[PDB]
Structure formats: structure tokens, C-alpha cells
Short mmCIF file of C-alpha atoms and ligand atoms in Angstrom, two decimals:
data_model
loop_
_atom_site.label_atom_id
_atom_site.label_comp_id
_atom_site.label_asym_id
_atom_site.label_seq_id
_atom_site.Cartn_x
_atom_site.Cartn_y
_atom_site.Cartn_z
CA UNK A 5 0.04 0.35 0.16
CA UNK A 6 0.76 3.91 -0.80
CA UNK A 7 -1.08 6.87 -0.52
CA UNK A 8 -1.16 9.00 -3.46
CA UNK A 9 -3.68 11.43 -0.47
CA UNK A 10 -1.06 12.87 0.60
CA UNK A 11 -2.30 16.32 -1.37
CA UNK A 12 -5.72 17.39 -3.23
CA UNK A 13 -6.87 14.80 -5.89
CA UNK A 14 -9.51 15.87 -8.52
CA UNK A 15 -12.53 12.94 -8.09
CA UNK A 16 -14.90 11.65 -10.51
CA UNK A 17 -18.58 9.74 -9.75
CA UNK A 18 -20.96 8.15 -11.94
CA UNK A 19 -23.46 6.37 -10.86
CA UNK A 20 -26.92 4.74 -12.89
CA UNK A 21 -29.60 3.80 -10.64
CA UNK A 22 -32.97 2.11 -11.51
CA UNK A 23 -35.27 2.13 -8.55
CA UNK A 24 -38.83 0.13 -9.37
CA UNK A 25 -38.10 0.78 -12.90
CA UNK A 26 -37.20 4.56 -12.17
CA UNK A 27 -34.51 5.49 -13.94
CA UNK A 28 -31.58 7.99 -13.60
CA UNK A 29 -28.28 8.90 -13.59
CA UNK A 30 -25.55 11.00 -11.78
CA UNK A 31 -21.93 12.47 -12.49
CA UNK A 32 -20.17 14.54 -10.09
CA UNK A 33 -16.64 15.82 -9.96
CA UNK A 34 -14.60 17.40 -6.93
CA UNK A 35 -11.21 17.43 -5.17
CA UNK A 36 -10.76 15.49 -1.72
CA UNK A 37 -7.79 16.04 0.76
CA UNK A 38 -7.14 12.66 3.01
CA UNK A 39 -4.98 14.74 5.20
CA UNK A 40 -7.71 16.93 6.85
CA UNK A 41 -10.83 14.27 5.94
CA UNK A 42 -12.39 16.48 3.68
CA UNK A 43 -14.34 16.11 0.60
CA UNK A 44 -15.73 18.97 -1.60
CA UNK A 45 -18.15 17.19 -4.89
CA UNK A 46 -21.30 18.79 -6.80
CA UNK A 47 -23.49 15.65 -8.05
CA UNK A 48 -25.78 16.47 -11.45
CA UNK A 49 -28.02 14.48 -12.12
CA UNK A 50 -28.14 13.66 -15.90
CA UNK A 51 -31.59 12.74 -16.74
CA UNK A 52 -33.71 15.46 -15.63
CA UNK A 53 -35.41 14.75 -11.78
CA UNK A 54 -34.03 12.64 -9.85
CA UNK A 55 -36.92 10.10 -8.76
CA UNK A 56 -35.18 9.69 -5.08
CA UNK A 57 -33.59 12.21 -2.18
CA UNK A 58 -30.44 13.22 -2.52
CA UNK A 59 -29.75 12.42 1.18
CA UNK A 60 -30.29 8.90 -0.18
CA UNK A 61 -27.66 9.02 -2.04
CA UNK A 62 -25.21 10.60 -0.27
CA UNK A 63 -23.05 7.45 0.81
CA UNK A 64 -23.54 5.73 -2.72
CA UNK A 65 -21.96 8.65 -3.98
CA UNK A 67 -15.20 6.96 -1.76
CA UNK A 68 -14.30 6.44 1.64
CA UNK A 69 -9.83 6.49 0.78
CA UNK A 70 -10.46 10.00 2.09
CA UNK A 71 -11.12 9.35 5.73
CA UNK A 72 -8.27 11.18 7.67
CA UNK A 73 -6.73 8.35 9.48
CA UNK A 74 -4.61 9.26 12.14
CA UNK A 75 -1.00 8.69 12.82
CA UNK A 76 -2.07 6.12 15.95
CA UNK A 77 -4.70 5.06 13.64
CA UNK A 78 -2.39 4.84 9.94
CA UNK A 79 -2.04 0.53 9.82
CA UNK A 80 -5.66 0.36 9.99
CA UNK A 81 -6.71 2.62 6.77
CA UNK A 82 -7.71 -0.41 4.26
CA UNK A 83 -8.52 1.87 1.40
CA UNK A 84 -5.85 3.61 0.87
CA UNK A 85 -4.02 0.60 0.73
CA UNK A 86 -5.87 -0.92 -1.94
CA UNK A 87 -4.58 2.33 -4.41
CA UNK A 88 -4.09 2.38 -7.14
CA UNK A 89 -5.62 -0.78 -8.32
CA UNK A 90 -9.11 0.67 -6.18
CA UNK A 91 -11.66 -1.70 -4.65
CA UNK A 92 -14.62 -3.04 -4.93
CA UNK A 93 -17.44 -1.03 -2.90
CA UNK A 94 -20.93 -3.48 -2.57
CA UNK A 95 -24.05 -2.47 0.02
CA UNK A 96 -27.32 -3.35 0.37
CA UNK A 97 -29.02 -0.65 2.40
CA UNK A 98 -32.14 -1.56 4.10
CA UNK A 99 -34.59 1.71 4.62
CA UNK A 100 -37.17 1.24 7.26
CA UNK A 101 -40.66 0.84 6.45
CA UNK A 102 -39.87 0.95 3.21
CA UNK A 103 -37.92 -0.66 -0.27
CA UNK A 104 -34.28 -1.06 0.15
CA UNK A 105 -31.23 0.08 -2.01
CA UNK A 106 -28.11 -2.75 -3.68
CA UNK A 107 -25.13 -1.33 -4.97
CA UNK A 108 -21.79 -2.14 -6.74
CA UNK A 109 -19.10 0.50 -7.58
CA UNK A 110 -15.73 0.49 -8.68
CA UNK A 111 -13.12 3.02 -6.45
CA UNK A 112 -9.45 3.52 -8.02
CA UNK A 113 -7.30 5.60 -9.68
CA UNK A 114 -7.48 6.80 -13.39
CA UNK A 115 -4.68 8.50 -14.37
CA UNK A 116 -4.07 10.94 -11.20
CA UNK A 117 -8.05 10.68 -10.56
CA UNK A 118 -9.76 8.76 -8.19
CA UNK A 119 -12.95 7.53 -9.74
CA UNK A 120 -16.09 5.82 -8.33
CA UNK A 121 -18.26 4.32 -10.71
CA UNK A 122 -21.86 2.94 -9.07
CA UNK A 123 -24.26 1.31 -10.81
CA UNK A 124 -27.38 1.27 -7.89
CA UNK A 125 -30.60 -1.50 -7.83
CA UNK A 126 -33.65 0.36 -5.52
CA UNK A 127 -37.11 -2.60 -4.87
CA UNK A 128 -40.19 -2.52 -3.02
CA UNK A 129 -40.54 0.86 -2.07
CA UNK A 130 -43.60 2.82 -2.16
CA UNK A 131 -45.19 4.92 -4.69
CA UNK A 132 -45.81 7.08 -1.86
CA UNK A 133 -43.44 6.50 0.65
CA UNK A 134 -40.39 8.67 1.92
CA UNK A 135 -38.56 7.74 -0.88
CA UNK A 136 -40.21 7.42 -4.43
CA UNK A 137 -42.50 10.52 -2.41
CA UNK A 138 -39.34 12.83 -1.98
CA UNK A 139 -40.33 13.18 1.82
CA UNK A 140 -36.92 13.72 3.33
CA UNK A 141 -35.46 16.98 4.52
CA UNK A 142 -32.04 18.57 2.18
CA UNK A 143 -30.36 19.97 5.39
CA UNK A 144 -27.01 16.68 6.49
CA UNK A 145 -26.86 13.61 7.22
CA UNK A 146 -24.24 11.83 9.85
CA UNK A 147 -22.72 8.89 11.88
CA UNK A 148 -20.11 6.76 12.18
CA UNK A 149 -19.13 4.13 9.88
CA UNK A 150 -18.31 0.72 11.94
CA UNK A 151 -15.46 -1.83 10.17
CA UNK A 152 -14.27 -4.87 10.88
CA UNK A 153 -11.60 -6.80 8.96
CA UNK A 154 -12.90 -10.23 6.39
CA UNK A 155 -9.92 -11.88 6.24
CA UNK A 156 -11.43 -14.64 4.27
CA UNK A 157 -12.23 -12.03 1.30
CA UNK A 158 -8.96 -9.90 1.95
CA UNK A 159 -11.06 -7.07 3.11
CA UNK A 160 -13.61 -5.32 4.97
CA UNK A 161 -17.48 -5.50 5.79
CA UNK A 162 -18.94 -2.02 7.58
CA UNK A 163 -22.30 -1.48 9.13
CA UNK A 164 -23.88 1.44 10.50
CA UNK A 165 -27.79 3.06 10.85
CA UNK A 166 -27.84 6.45 8.99
CA UNK A 167 -31.08 8.37 9.40
CA UNK A 168 -31.87 11.07 7.69
CA UNK A 169 -35.04 14.31 8.56
CA UNK A 170 -38.34 13.52 7.16
CA UNK A 171 -40.43 16.73 6.13
CA UNK A 172 -42.57 16.52 9.57
CA UNK A 173 -39.54 16.64 11.97
CA UNK A 174 -39.64 12.49 12.25
CA UNK A 175 -36.79 10.73 11.81
CA UNK A 176 -36.30 7.86 8.53
CA UNK A 177 -33.80 4.92 9.13
CA UNK A 178 -31.73 3.59 6.66
CA UNK A 179 -30.06 0.08 7.35
CA UNK A 180 -26.18 -0.19 5.67
CA UNK A 181 -24.17 -3.28 5.09
CA UNK A 182 -20.84 -3.26 3.47
CA UNK A 183 -18.26 -5.03 2.60
CA UNK A 184 -14.99 -4.06 -0.03
CA UNK A 185 -12.38 -6.03 -1.63
CA UNK A 186 -9.74 -5.17 -3.11
CA UNK A 187 -9.78 -5.00 -6.93
CA UNK A 188 -5.54 -6.11 -7.65
CA UNK A 189 -3.72 -9.43 -5.43
CA UNK A 190 -0.91 -7.23 -3.59
CA UNK A 191 -0.76 -6.90 0.20
CA UNK A 192 -3.62 -4.60 1.91
CA UNK A 193 -4.28 -3.01 5.75
CA UNK A 194 -6.65 -5.31 7.56
CA UNK A 195 -7.85 -3.52 10.82
CA UNK A 196 -8.75 -3.68 13.77
CA UNK A 197 -12.11 -3.09 14.91
CA UNK A 198 -12.82 0.77 14.40
CA UNK A 199 -14.48 3.23 13.05
CA UNK A 200 -15.35 6.39 9.62
CA UNK A 201 -16.93 9.55 11.98
CA UNK A 202 -18.90 11.04 9.34
CA UNK A 203 -20.52 14.46 8.28
CA UNK A 204 -22.36 15.06 5.04
CA UNK A 205 -23.66 19.16 4.69
CA UNK A 206 -26.00 19.06 1.84
CA UNK A 207 -26.85 22.39 -0.27
CA UNK A 208 -27.09 23.98 -3.77
CA UNK A 209 -25.37 26.14 -6.38
CA UNK A 210 -27.54 29.15 -7.30
CA UNK A 211 -26.19 29.55 -9.89
CA UNK A 212 -27.09 25.70 -11.61
CA UNK A 213 -30.61 24.86 -13.20
CA UNK A 214 -29.55 20.82 -13.20
CA UNK A 215 -31.61 18.88 -10.35
CA UNK A 216 -27.99 18.51 -8.23
CA UNK A 217 -26.54 18.34 -4.38
CA UNK A 218 -23.61 20.42 -3.79
CA UNK A 219 -21.87 18.05 -0.82
CA UNK A 220 -19.43 18.74 1.68
CA UNK A 221 -18.20 16.13 3.85
CA UNK A 222 -15.77 15.58 6.61
CA UNK A 223 -15.04 11.87 7.43
CA UNK A 224 -12.36 10.74 10.56
CA UNK A 225 -11.27 7.39 11.44
CA UNK A 226 -11.47 6.60 15.31
CA UNK A 227 -11.18 3.72 17.52
CA UNK A 228 -12.45 3.94 21.40
CA UNK A 229 -10.03 3.26 24.00
CA UNK A 230 -10.74 2.75 27.59
CA UNK A 231 -8.34 5.03 28.09
CA UNK A 232 -9.33 8.11 26.20
CA UNK A 233 -12.90 8.76 28.36
CA UNK A 234 -13.08 9.61 32.79
CA UNK A 235 -13.74 7.83 35.29
CA UNK A 236 -17.14 9.63 35.12
CA UNK A 237 -17.99 8.77 32.06
CA UNK A 238 -17.22 5.36 31.37
CA UNK A 239 -19.21 5.24 35.01
CA UNK A 240 -21.83 6.35 33.24
CA UNK A 241 -21.82 4.66 30.46
CA UNK A 242 -21.73 1.49 32.72
CA UNK A 243 -24.74 2.93 34.49
CA UNK A 244 -27.17 3.25 31.21
CA UNK A 245 -26.66 -0.87 30.65
CA UNK A 246 -27.40 -1.43 35.34
CA UNK A 247 -30.49 0.32 34.54
CA UNK A 248 -31.55 -1.57 37.93
CA UNK A 249 -28.61 -0.19 39.67
CA UNK A 250 -28.24 -3.13 41.24
CA UNK A 251 -24.17 -2.39 40.17
CA UNK A 252 -24.35 -5.41 37.57
CA UNK A 253 -25.50 -6.00 34.04
CA UNK A 254 -27.41 -9.10 32.99
CA UNK A 255 -28.96 -10.91 30.96
CA UNK A 256 -32.18 -8.83 30.15
CA UNK A 257 -30.08 -5.82 30.33
CA UNK A 258 -27.47 -6.20 27.96
CA UNK A 259 -29.94 -7.52 25.34
CA UNK A 260 -32.75 -3.93 26.03
CA UNK A 261 -29.36 -1.32 25.99
CA UNK A 262 -26.72 -2.55 23.02
CA UNK A 263 -30.37 -3.13 20.70
CA UNK A 264 -30.02 0.77 21.35
CA UNK A 265 -26.55 0.88 19.47
CA UNK A 266 -28.38 0.07 16.13
CA UNK A 267 -30.93 -2.42 14.90
CA UNK A 268 -29.10 -5.01 12.83
CA UNK A 269 -27.93 -7.33 16.00
CA UNK A 270 -29.68 -10.39 15.67
CA UNK A 271 -30.63 -12.60 18.80
CA UNK A 272 -27.70 -14.62 18.68
CA UNK A 273 -25.24 -12.17 18.12
CA UNK A 274 -26.38 -10.92 21.07
CA UNK A 275 -25.99 -13.92 23.17
CA UNK A 276 -22.60 -13.94 21.29
CA UNK A 277 -22.03 -10.26 22.98
CA UNK A 278 -22.76 -11.33 26.44
CA UNK A 279 -20.44 -14.66 25.85
CA UNK A 280 -17.24 -12.59 24.96
CA UNK A 281 -17.29 -9.89 27.55
CA UNK A 282 -18.48 -12.72 30.24
CA UNK A 283 -14.83 -13.74 30.82
CA UNK A 284 -15.39 -15.00 34.44
CA UNK A 285 -19.04 -17.08 33.62
CA UNK A 286 -21.02 -15.93 35.74
CA UNK A 287 -24.00 -14.86 34.61
CA UNK A 288 -22.80 -10.46 34.18
CA UNK A 289 -21.16 -8.22 33.33
CA UNK A 290 -18.90 -6.32 35.97
CA UNK A 291 -17.55 -3.07 35.65
CA UNK A 292 -14.33 -4.37 34.38
CA UNK A 293 -15.60 -6.88 32.05
CA UNK A 294 -17.83 -3.59 31.23
CA UNK A 295 -13.98 -1.88 29.93
CA UNK A 296 -13.22 -4.91 27.88
CA UNK A 297 -16.71 -5.46 26.48
CA UNK A 298 -16.57 -1.06 25.35
CA UNK A 299 -13.20 -1.86 23.42
CA UNK A 300 -13.94 -4.77 21.34
CA UNK A 301 -17.55 -3.78 20.93
CA UNK A 302 -17.66 -0.24 18.88
CA UNK A 303 -20.49 1.35 18.99
CA UNK A 304 -21.07 1.20 22.59
CA UNK A 305 -19.85 4.45 23.98
CA UNK A 306 -20.02 6.60 20.40
CA UNK A 307 -23.73 5.21 20.11
CA UNK A 308 -24.90 5.30 23.81
CA UNK A 309 -22.77 8.04 25.10
CA UNK A 310 -21.13 10.18 21.74
CA UNK A 311 -22.74 13.31 21.31
CA UNK A 312 -25.13 12.67 24.07
CA UNK A 313 -25.98 14.98 27.32
CA UNK A 314 -27.86 13.03 30.19
CA UNK A 315 -30.90 13.44 31.93
CA UNK A 316 -30.64 12.14 35.21
CA UNK A 317 -34.63 11.85 36.34
CA UNK A 318 -34.97 10.79 39.86
CA UNK A 319 -39.58 9.92 40.22
CA UNK A 320 -42.34 9.37 42.60
CA UNK A 321 -45.71 8.47 42.46
CA UNK A 322 -48.42 9.04 45.36
CA UNK A 323 -51.90 7.99 45.34
CA UNK A 324 -53.84 11.22 45.31
CA UNK A 325 -57.33 9.07 46.59
CA UNK A 326 -57.06 6.81 50.19
CA UNK A 327 -59.19 3.79 48.08
CA UNK A 328 -56.89 0.84 47.67
CA UNK A 329 -53.74 0.89 45.46
CA UNK A 330 -51.40 -1.43 43.13
CA UNK A 331 -47.82 -1.84 45.08
CA UNK A 332 -45.50 -3.70 42.72
CA UNK A 333 -42.91 -6.28 42.63
CA UNK A 334 -39.99 -4.31 40.26
CA UNK A 335 -40.31 -4.57 36.96
CA UNK A 336 -39.85 -1.94 34.25
CA UNK A 337 -41.16 -0.14 32.09
CA UNK A 338 -40.58 0.05 28.09
CA UNK A 339 -40.48 3.61 25.94
CA UNK A 340 -40.39 4.51 22.71
CA UNK A 341 -40.88 7.93 21.42
CA UNK A 342 -41.73 10.14 18.20
CA UNK A 343 -40.82 13.79 17.66
CA UNK A 344 -43.12 15.42 14.91
CA UNK A 345 -45.05 18.61 13.75
CA UNK A 346 -48.08 19.40 12.70
CA UNK A 347 -47.23 21.34 9.48
CA UNK A 348 -50.45 23.33 9.80
CA UNK A 349 -49.56 24.99 13.57
CA UNK A 350 -47.92 28.14 13.53
CA UNK A 351 -47.48 28.52 17.51
CA UNK A 352 -44.19 26.55 18.45
CA UNK A 353 -45.48 23.01 19.72
CA UNK A 354 -44.78 18.82 19.63
CA UNK A 355 -46.29 16.01 18.36
CA UNK A 356 -45.77 13.59 20.38
CA UNK A 357 -45.94 9.89 19.93
CA UNK A 358 -45.13 7.73 22.76
CA UNK A 359 -45.46 3.61 23.09
CA UNK A 360 -45.28 1.94 26.34
CA UNK A 361 -44.93 -1.52 27.47
CA UNK A 362 -43.90 -2.89 31.22
CA UNK A 363 -41.70 -6.13 31.36
CA UNK A 364 -39.33 -7.22 33.69
CA UNK A 365 -41.04 -10.04 36.05
CA UNK A 366 -39.98 -13.45 34.64
CA UNK A 367 -43.25 -15.36 33.61
CA UNK A 368 -43.11 -16.94 36.54
CA UNK A 383 -58.00 -4.66 38.10
CA UNK A 384 -60.20 -1.96 39.75
CA UNK A 385 -59.74 1.75 37.83
CA UNK A 386 -58.37 -0.09 34.98
CA UNK A 387 -61.77 -0.57 33.21
CA UNK A 388 -60.96 3.02 32.72
CA UNK A 389 -58.83 2.22 30.27
CA UNK A 390 -60.23 -0.27 27.97
CA UNK A 391 -60.70 2.45 26.03
CA UNK A 392 -59.16 5.12 23.58
CA UNK A 393 -59.19 7.90 26.37
CA UNK A 394 -59.00 11.68 25.62
CA UNK A 395 -55.83 13.70 27.31
CA UNK A 396 -55.55 17.24 28.84
CA UNK A 397 -51.85 18.34 29.15
CA UNK A 398 -51.44 22.24 31.08
CA UNK A 399 -47.82 22.49 31.90
CA UNK A 400 -46.73 26.01 33.79
CA UNK A 401 -42.67 26.12 33.71
CA UNK A 402 -40.25 28.97 34.62
CA UNK A 403 -36.34 27.77 33.88
CA UNK A 404 -33.83 30.68 35.17
CA UNK A 405 -36.89 33.19 35.26
CA UNK A 406 -37.85 32.17 31.98
CA UNK A 407 -41.62 31.73 32.68
CA UNK A 408 -43.25 29.45 29.86
CA UNK A 409 -47.34 27.81 29.40
CA UNK A 410 -47.55 24.90 27.82
CA UNK A 411 -51.78 23.30 25.97
CA UNK A 412 -52.09 20.03 25.05
CA UNK A 413 -54.34 17.43 24.11
CA UNK A 414 -54.50 14.58 22.46
CA UNK A 415 -55.92 10.46 23.13
CA UNK A 416 -54.24 7.28 24.98
CA UNK A 417 -54.47 3.82 23.89
CA UNK A 418 -53.75 1.56 26.64
CA UNK A 419 -54.46 -1.88 25.33
CA UNK A 420 -51.49 -1.00 22.58
CA UNK A 421 -49.61 1.25 24.91
CA UNK A 422 -50.37 4.14 22.71
CA UNK A 423 -50.38 7.92 23.04
CA UNK A 424 -50.47 10.78 20.87
CA UNK A 425 -50.48 14.09 21.93
CA UNK A 426 -49.93 17.74 20.63
CA UNK A 427 -48.21 20.16 22.99
CA UNK A 428 -48.40 24.04 22.53
CA UNK A 429 -46.17 26.77 23.56
CA UNK A 430 -49.04 29.26 24.10
CA UNK A 431 -46.54 32.19 25.66
CA UNK A 432 -45.18 31.94 22.23
CA UNK A 433 -41.07 30.67 21.54
CA UNK A 434 -40.49 27.55 24.42
CA UNK A 435 -37.25 29.11 25.62
CA UNK A 436 -36.12 24.92 26.51
CA UNK A 437 -35.66 21.85 23.58
CA UNK A 438 -39.00 20.24 23.51
CA UNK A 439 -37.15 17.51 24.00
CA UNK A 440 -36.48 17.76 27.54
CA UNK A 441 -39.71 18.53 28.32
CA UNK A 442 -40.92 15.49 26.67
CA UNK A 443 -40.33 13.35 30.00
CA UNK A 444 -42.51 15.64 31.72
CA UNK A 445 -45.28 16.02 29.20
CA UNK A 447 -49.20 9.42 31.55
CA UNK A 448 -47.32 5.68 32.47
CA UNK A 449 -51.09 4.66 33.10
CA UNK A 450 -51.48 4.44 28.72
CA UNK A 451 -48.27 1.84 29.15
CA UNK A 452 -49.50 -1.97 28.04
CA UNK A 453 -48.79 -4.04 31.19
CA UNK A 454 -48.79 -7.89 30.46
CA UNK A 455 -51.73 -10.05 31.58
CA UNK A 456 -49.13 -11.66 34.26
CA UNK A 457 -48.25 -8.42 35.24
CA UNK A 458 -51.95 -6.54 35.42
CA UNK A 459 -51.62 -7.07 39.28
CA UNK A 460 -48.01 -4.46 39.71
CA UNK A 461 -49.89 -1.55 37.40
CA UNK A 462 -49.93 1.14 40.58
CA UNK A 463 -51.16 4.12 37.56
CA UNK A 464 -54.40 2.24 36.66
CA UNK A 465 -55.02 1.62 40.14
CA UNK A 466 -55.54 4.73 41.66
CA UNK A 467 -57.74 6.38 38.94
CA UNK A 468 -60.15 7.26 38.92
CA UNK A 469 -59.16 9.99 41.33
CA UNK A 470 -55.48 9.84 40.43
CA UNK A 471 -51.95 10.18 41.15
CA UNK A 472 -49.40 12.97 41.81
CA UNK A 473 -46.29 12.36 40.28
CA UNK A 474 -43.09 14.40 41.30
CA UNK A 475 -39.35 13.98 39.94
CA UNK A 476 -36.27 16.16 39.67
CA UNK A 477 -34.17 15.66 36.23
CA UNK A 478 -30.11 16.45 36.23
CA UNK A 479 -29.13 17.40 33.06
CA UNK A 480 -25.72 16.84 33.62
CA UNK A 481 -23.08 19.50 33.86
CA UNK A 482 -25.86 22.13 33.57
CA UNK A 483 -29.00 23.08 35.50
CA UNK A 484 -32.19 20.84 37.41
CA UNK A 485 -36.30 20.33 36.27
CA UNK A 486 -38.48 19.95 38.94
CA UNK A 487 -42.19 18.79 38.61
CA UNK A 488 -44.96 18.12 40.58
CA UNK A 489 -47.85 16.66 38.79
CA UNK A 490 -51.55 15.54 39.41
CA UNK A 491 -52.29 12.48 36.85
CA UNK A 492 -56.69 12.07 37.17
CA UNK A 493 -59.77 11.93 35.46
CA UNK A 494 -62.12 15.50 34.94
CA UNK A 495 -65.45 13.74 33.49
CA UNK A 496 -64.18 11.13 30.55
CA UNK A 497 -61.29 13.23 30.09
CA UNK A 498 -57.89 12.22 31.62
CA UNK A 499 -55.79 15.28 33.10
CA UNK A 500 -52.13 15.68 33.57
CA UNK A 501 -51.71 19.19 35.41
CA UNK A 502 -47.48 20.13 35.81
CA UNK A 503 -45.74 23.42 37.59
CA UNK A 504 -42.11 22.92 36.37
CA UNK A 505 -38.83 25.29 38.25
CA UNK A 506 -35.46 24.94 36.73
CA UNK A 507 -32.60 26.24 38.16
CA UNK A 508 -28.78 26.95 37.42
CA UNK A 509 -28.77 26.01 33.68
CA UNK A 510 -25.68 27.96 31.49
CA UNK A 511 -27.61 30.51 29.23
CA UNK A 512 -24.98 29.06 26.30
CA UNK A 513 -25.61 25.50 27.32
CA UNK A 514 -26.89 23.06 25.34
CA UNK A 515 -30.87 23.53 27.14
CA UNK A 516 -30.65 27.58 27.18
CA UNK A 517 -29.01 28.04 23.26
CA UNK A 518 -31.33 25.17 21.97
CA UNK A 519 -28.52 22.04 20.85
CA UNK A 520 -30.72 19.43 20.88
CA UNK A 521 -31.51 17.77 18.26
CA UNK A 522 -35.69 17.20 16.95
CA UNK A 523 -34.94 13.47 18.02
CA UNK A 524 -36.08 10.73 21.11
CA UNK A 525 -34.48 7.64 22.07
CA UNK A 526 -35.76 4.82 23.79
CA UNK A 527 -36.05 3.51 27.44
CA UNK A 528 -35.75 1.93 29.74
CA UNK A 529 -38.00 3.16 33.11
CA UNK A 530 -36.96 0.83 35.95
CA UNK A 531 -39.73 0.53 38.51
CA UNK A 532 -39.45 -0.05 41.91
CA UNK A 533 -42.23 -0.01 45.07
CA UNK A 534 -41.83 3.02 47.55
CA UNK A 535 -44.76 1.04 50.11
CA UNK A 536 -44.23 3.87 52.81
CA UNK A 537 -46.13 6.65 50.68
CA UNK A 538 -48.02 4.07 49.33
CA UNK A 539 -46.87 4.63 45.79
CA UNK A 540 -43.87 3.77 43.67
CA UNK A 541 -40.10 5.77 42.00
CA UNK A 542 -38.22 4.96 39.88
CA UNK A 543 -34.40 6.68 38.62
CA UNK A 544 -33.35 6.65 34.80
CA UNK A 545 -30.94 7.97 32.61
CA UNK A 546 -32.85 10.46 29.36
CA UNK A 547 -30.05 10.82 26.55
CA UNK A 548 -30.81 13.57 24.43
CA UNK A 549 -29.06 13.92 21.73
CA UNK A 550 -26.70 17.27 20.52
CA UNK A 551 -27.24 19.59 17.69
CA1 CA B 1 -27.71 -4.64 36.80
CA1 CA B 2 -18.90 -11.92 34.42
#
């Protein structure tokens, strides 16, 4: 292997595509600067209008221009295969839509680096997010997780790539990648690492054709525990250890490891657990966790990278004196979707929550009010660092499917904090408890007359929220009335400086009884993505 990438290199890109019978060609040109991990490319659809969104093609349309730091040069397969080049193949699975299969040759032709690609797409929905042009033209980013494939003399890569849908929600594209060298000469076969990639999409004002301008940065990295503080490694362990007992069990690992990506089978999970549990005692201690972080490269970058932790401490008490169910220990699995009503002019959040109860092995009263689609009202008054605001919401809850849908409006103008920081504050009564767990649903048992739900939320390296809510029925409407006080926030921090992404991760909320207050309590870590 040799470095023809020491300076600036001219790039050509040619793609021929067919997605659901819709043919198209793309031609691009630009420059690559590997020493700074930089590309600049202008891409043109030569066949008129592109039948798919430009952001779906970014990854298909030259990773040999990655910046490999000096301590990682021995892991750069891409450059080592030059000038003869490599074959890059992918299958890209769009969530709830079709897939692309791609085959590219990336090689030198003279002193120009050329990417020649054929792409075939199938099973797309003609008015899906892809063929219906429903994605935003923003920016994409992600980590490309590389492992050696010694059998083919090359590498594999996987990564989930997110792209914003026009309604503010997120489209997932699951990438499976292979690279093999075109020639016979030696190549570097790397230890597990990843490419940290940020893509900037824009337009030329002077270009009439359907096109994309791309500025892109690609940097090689490898997670090492030596490069994180005790604090950070402890935080990361605690994401896994969500029952707070100091050790990671199999159920926990299964739950949390699947938040690092969508591409692990039940067997892959069993394997990682077995490999990490080096003393075979059925649990991952902290020393074992530290090895597991280096061996399974996605863990720290996906759970902790670019994340703002919010530590929640919660307590729920019945308003009534009627008897309630106090549960054995268990947890709630939360998935959340954030979107925008395109006809609401005020600052607002549409929130969809999926919530199921789990974590009791296998071996009513105010249930009934939830049989039952139930209308919800939400009222919050807030004060964060002296900044007052009110939120008013309405929607529906469906406990039989663990589903709720809410539209929330800031009635005082512009919300002085990001909507995602209020998601947890703005209805655990709409969780679906399995039939073997119905005796553990405190939340429904307190209805009709309801419960108080208090929290303290600690934003790491920033201020905290304190909340008090009453959740009760008034007639046939379920009402959540909340006061929120926030203090000690930094005016240029991630909260008051609005540097949190408009999306939401999945979480497991461990619930325990609090018999002395005749209720339940819970503490859990929320993970807000930064930017
Ligand atoms: Ca544990
Ligand atoms: Ca162990």
C-alpha cells in the first residue's frame, strides 16, 4: 500500500440507478483532501429530475479520503488498495420502505480518483418517503463501524443512517457494506474501528439542473477506555445497569445493546454477552464492561457520543385513599416519536409514545377506565432561570396498545428550552402491562381520583428541573397538570442555547415500590442527542 492521498486529489463520480423501474444517472466531480478528511463534490442528475431524494444517495455517491490519525495508519484498508482500487458493495434497507443494492468500483484512472456505481432499488412505496420526496435536504451524520473480513481480504461495515423526514420525524437507512480489493498486492486488514462522518448538503444558486453540493468530513477513530474519564465510563455502565444493582444482567444487556443499532440478531446478542462475561457468572461486572466497550466499538459512541444525559428521579403517590397496587420490581420500555403538525403556526410538539411493561419473568379496579381510547388534556406552567412559559396539550391514550398521541402548544410564544427536555414531564397510566403483570400497574389502580408525579431531573453539567404533576380523571378526560421550576442552567448550554436535536431515544424505566408513601419510585437516565 502507498499514499497517493498526501495532497489534494481530483474526484469523478458516475452512478447509474434503477429504483422501482425509475431509471436515472448521476455525474459528479470535485476534490478530496485526505490529510484533513475533507471532500467537496458537486453531483448532477443528468437524466432530468432525480426520482429519489438526494440524501438517500449520499452514502452511495469514496472513503479512501478518510483522515486516519497517526496512531491508526495501520488500519486504513481503503488507501492500501490504491491505485488498483476496491469494490464497494452495499445493501441499504430503508425502514418501512424498500432497499438499495449497490456495487461500485473505486479506483484511480490517471491522477483522478473515480467512483463508478450501479444501484438497484426494489419494493419501495410509490408514495413512500423515498419515491414521494418526503425527506429534508439538510445534513447527515453517523459512524461507519468497520471490521476485517480476512476470508475476502477486505472489510465489512455497518451503520444505521438517519435522515430527517419533512414532518420532523426520522427515516432510518440500515447499511450493510463489503469492500474487496481489485488487485492481488498486499492490503491492510484493520482492528475494529469506525469512520466518524458528517455530510453537509446545499445548492449552487447558478445551477438549473437537479443537483447536490456536498461538503463532507470523514475521520477514523477507535474507542479506547483510556480516552474517557471515570465519570464517563461510569455513566456508560449505568446506562446498561438500569436496575442500579451494580452489575449488567442478560435481560439488561439485551435491552440496551439494541439501542446501539438495529442490526443485531438474538444470536449476535448471546455471543457478545458470552464473550464479555469472561468469568462465566451470568453478569457483566465493571472490569468486563471496560473490555466489552473496546471490543464492541459501537457501545460508547452510540450511547454516550454527542449525548446530553438527564438523570430523572421520580416518585408517584395516590391522591385518593382507595386501595392501590404496589408493584414488584419491573420496568417500562419507552419508544417515542417527535413530529410537527405542518398547519400549526405556534411553537409546538406532536409526541407519540409506545410504552410496554416488562421485567417480571412469567413464573384491575381503575383498569376498565382504560379499555378504552381516552382523551387526554395537558397543562404545564414553567419557569427556567426566570424564563416563564406555558404549554397546553391535548390528545388520546390507548392503554390496550400502550399508545399515546399528543399535540402540545407553547401558549406563551417561543419555548425557552428544547421540546425534548419536556417529553418526560409532558402518562404512565397508558402503559400496556402484560396479563401476567396486571397486579403491578400502580398507575391505573390510582384512577379515577389519580396520582401525584414528582421529579427532579439533573442535566449533566447544567441545571435541573423540578416538577410536580397531578394525573387524574375529570369526567371522561384524563388530565395531566404540571408545574415546573428550573434553576442553575447555563445561558449558552445545550438547554437554554437550544442545541438538542428534535428527536427522542428509547429508554427503560425501572420502577420499584415505595410502600411508605403508598406508591412507586423510579430513577432513570434519559439521553438527548446534541445538535
Ligand atoms: Ca443491573
Ligand atoms: Ca462476569
